[PDB]
Amino acid sequence: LPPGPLENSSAKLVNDEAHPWKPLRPGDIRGPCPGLNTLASHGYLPRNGVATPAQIINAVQEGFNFDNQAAIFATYAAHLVDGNLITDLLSIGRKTRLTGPDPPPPASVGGLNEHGTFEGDASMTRGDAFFGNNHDFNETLFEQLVDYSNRFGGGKYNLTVAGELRFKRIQDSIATNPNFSFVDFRFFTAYGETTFPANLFVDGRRDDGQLDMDAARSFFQFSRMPDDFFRAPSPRSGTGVEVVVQAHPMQPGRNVGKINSYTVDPTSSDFSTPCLMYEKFVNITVKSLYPNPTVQLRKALNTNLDFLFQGVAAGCTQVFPYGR
Ligand code: HEM
Numbered sequence: 001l002p003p004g005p006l007e008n009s010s011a012k013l014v015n016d017e018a019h020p021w022k023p024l025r026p027g028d029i030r031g032p033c034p035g036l037n038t039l040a041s042h043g044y045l046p047r048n049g050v051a052t053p054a055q056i057i058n059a060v061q062e063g064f065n066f067d068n069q070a071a072i073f074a075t076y077a078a079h080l081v082d083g084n085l086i087t088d089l090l091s092i093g094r095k096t097r098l099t100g101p102d103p104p105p106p107a108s109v110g111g112l113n114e115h116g117t118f119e120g121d122a123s124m125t126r127g128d129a130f131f132g133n134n135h136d137f138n139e140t141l142f143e144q145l146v147d148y149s150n151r152f153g154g155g156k157y158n159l160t161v162a163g164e165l166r167f168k169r170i171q172d173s174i175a176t177n178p179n180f181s182f183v184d185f186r187f188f189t190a191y192g193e194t195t196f197p198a199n200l201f202v203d204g205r206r207d208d209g210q211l212d213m214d215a216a217r218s219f220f221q222f223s224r225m226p227d228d229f230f231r232a233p234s235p236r237s238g239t240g241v242e243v244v245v246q247a248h249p250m251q252p253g254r255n256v257g258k259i260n261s262y263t264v265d266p267t268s269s270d271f272s273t274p275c276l277m278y279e280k281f282v283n284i285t286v287k288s289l290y291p292n293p294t295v296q297l298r299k300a301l302n303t304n305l306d307f308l309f310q311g312v313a314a315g316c317t318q319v320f321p322y323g324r
């Protein structure tokens, strides 16, 4: 079952004796998420980067005070599209034999590195998949984050910086990635993720929304909590995303095989239709990976879809692609 919320959600030291940072060993997997990467590199998750959904939910809550509903929604969304539903294992990065025997195609079980399922374009510190690497820390992109922090945040990353940088990334992908896609699930996640450094990488004794660049580099590049890091003082995820959207409101769309051809998609969900985002994720995205599953896969899909629905925070009706 999905873990419940923390019994005690106070700020506390999370870079503690039981959770030291360690460098990668051969075979250890890290991916496009600095949050999960840091949890693995401090042993809140298995240090090889392969974990169960329950391990992930417990880790994001314990290590960073990510809220329960957000933890459930993201984890089961990722697991459904990128994880092995029979073995209950998900890679936080590249595809690996460590998640067990694969299901039939068209399911990919590609880990969080799989482009276009959860991971997508216009990430802050990772390049678009079209440019060759959607998962490793990129120094040039991080230096741009530093520059935007200097210009809009007095040298710190905050929600104002997030609003400007989110738009800059989108405009750079429009100008250079002929395959740029910015619809449905990615349209939502791209905005939410820009709040996370301000909400969750800021030491919880301060919780002022102002992330310094030493801490930012530590998390984004090295998957490493600052010495004496205290987690956030209460559960949260995407609060302040309205500030990021308001700075430069966008419509969902994609380039259409050429640069500078961004074409709005009226069949995409947007922030006015969160329940459509959920329904398409299940009916189209998940269903297309598993169109006619065998008995044990069908059971695992339905269980994980029930868990996903527990995380749906927008008053939506559950949908059932494989029946009740
Ligand atoms: C709850 C389970 C979570 C999963 C499965 C997850 C997975 C992912 C994935 C696959 C991405 C790639 C999105 C992209 O293409 O840019 C991403 C982005 C990101 N996640 Fe998470 N995430 C989770 C929770 C968290 C938490 C708790 C934090 C912080 C504590 C966090 C911080 C970030 C950041 C900062 C990015 C954007 C990085 C960048 O654009 O450079 N995530 N997440």
Ligand SMILES: *[C@@H]1O[C@H](CO)[C@@H](O)[C@H](O)[C@H]1NC(C)=O
Pocket (backbone or CB within 6 Å): 008, 009, 010, 011, 012
């Ligand atoms: C919750 O944890 C904090 C920090 O560890 C501690 O100060 C506080 O006493 C705890 N609360 C309860 C009810 O145990």
Ligand SMILES: *[C@@H]1O[C@H](CO)[C@@H](O)[C@H](O)[C@H]1NC(C)=O
Pocket (backbone or CB within 6 Å): 115, 116, 129, 130, 179, 181
């Ligand atoms: C190109 O875009 C499509 C989605 O429209 C996606 O399936 C494909 O993986 C993308 N490839 C790259 C390398 O961006």
Ligand SMILES: *[C@@H]1O[C@H](CO)[C@@H](O)[C@H](O)[C@H]1NC(C)=O
Pocket (backbone or CB within 6 Å): 127, 138, 139, 140, 141
């Ligand atoms: C990092 O991002 C820059 C800017 O988009 C890109 O030119 C470069 O190839 C990327 N990769 C590395 C390894 O720097």
Ligand SMILES: *[C@@H]1O[C@H](CO)[C@@H](O)[C@H](O)[C@H]1NC(C)=O
Pocket (backbone or CB within 6 Å): 152, 153, 154, 158, 159, 160, 161, 209
């Ligand atoms: C970001 O920092 C700048 C400079 O200190 C400030 O003007 C702006 O109000 C800050 N934004 C937020 C949301 O804290």
Ligand SMILES: *[C@@H]1O[C@H](CO)[C@@H](O)[C@H](O)[C@H]1NC(C)=O
Pocket (backbone or CB within 6 Å): 276, 279, 280, 283, 319, 320, 321
């Ligand atoms: C999803 O499928 C259900 C039937 O299982 C249907 O009622 C619903 O309208 C579908 N939603 C979308 C957005 O296709």
Ligand SMILES: Oc1cccc2ccccc12
Pocket (backbone or CB within 6 Å): 070, 071, 073, 074, 075, 188, 189, 190, 192, 193, 237, 238
């Ligand atoms: O874990 C996550 C990663 C990226 C985006 C998210 C948006 C909402 C809730 C969780 C998210």
Ligand SMILES: Oc1cccc2ccccc12
Pocket (backbone or CB within 6 Å): 070, 188, 189, 191, 192, 193, 237, 238, 239, 241
């Ligand atoms: O309202 C939102 C929009 C997009 C992403 C989010 C992630 C977490 C929490 C709320 C979010």
Ligand SMILES: Oc1cccc2ccccc12
Pocket (backbone or CB within 6 Å): 238, 239, 240, 241, 242, 245, 271
């Ligand atoms: O953060 C949020 C929470 C709930 C609803 C939202 C709607 C739009 C934009 C952001 C939102």
Ligand SMILES: Oc1cccc2ccccc12
Pocket (backbone or CB within 6 Å): 270, 271, 272, 273, 274, 313, 314
């Ligand atoms: O865009 C939105 C509108 C209303 C409620 C939401 C809840 C979560 C995430 C997004 C939302």
Ligand SMILES: Oc1cccc2ccccc12
Pocket (backbone or CB within 6 Å): 069, 070, 073, 188, 274, 275, 277, 278, 311, 312, 313, 314
């Ligand atoms: O719980 C949520 C968090 C972020 C985005 C969402 C979009 C739709 C439905 C639920 C959502």
Ligand SMILES: [Cl-]
Pocket (backbone or CB within 6 Å): 005, 006, 066, 067, 068, 069, 235
């Ligand atoms: Cl919570």
Ligand SMILES: [Mg+2]
Pocket (backbone or CB within 6 Å): 032, 119, 120, 121, 122, 123, 126, 127, 128, 134
């Ligand atoms: Mg990306």
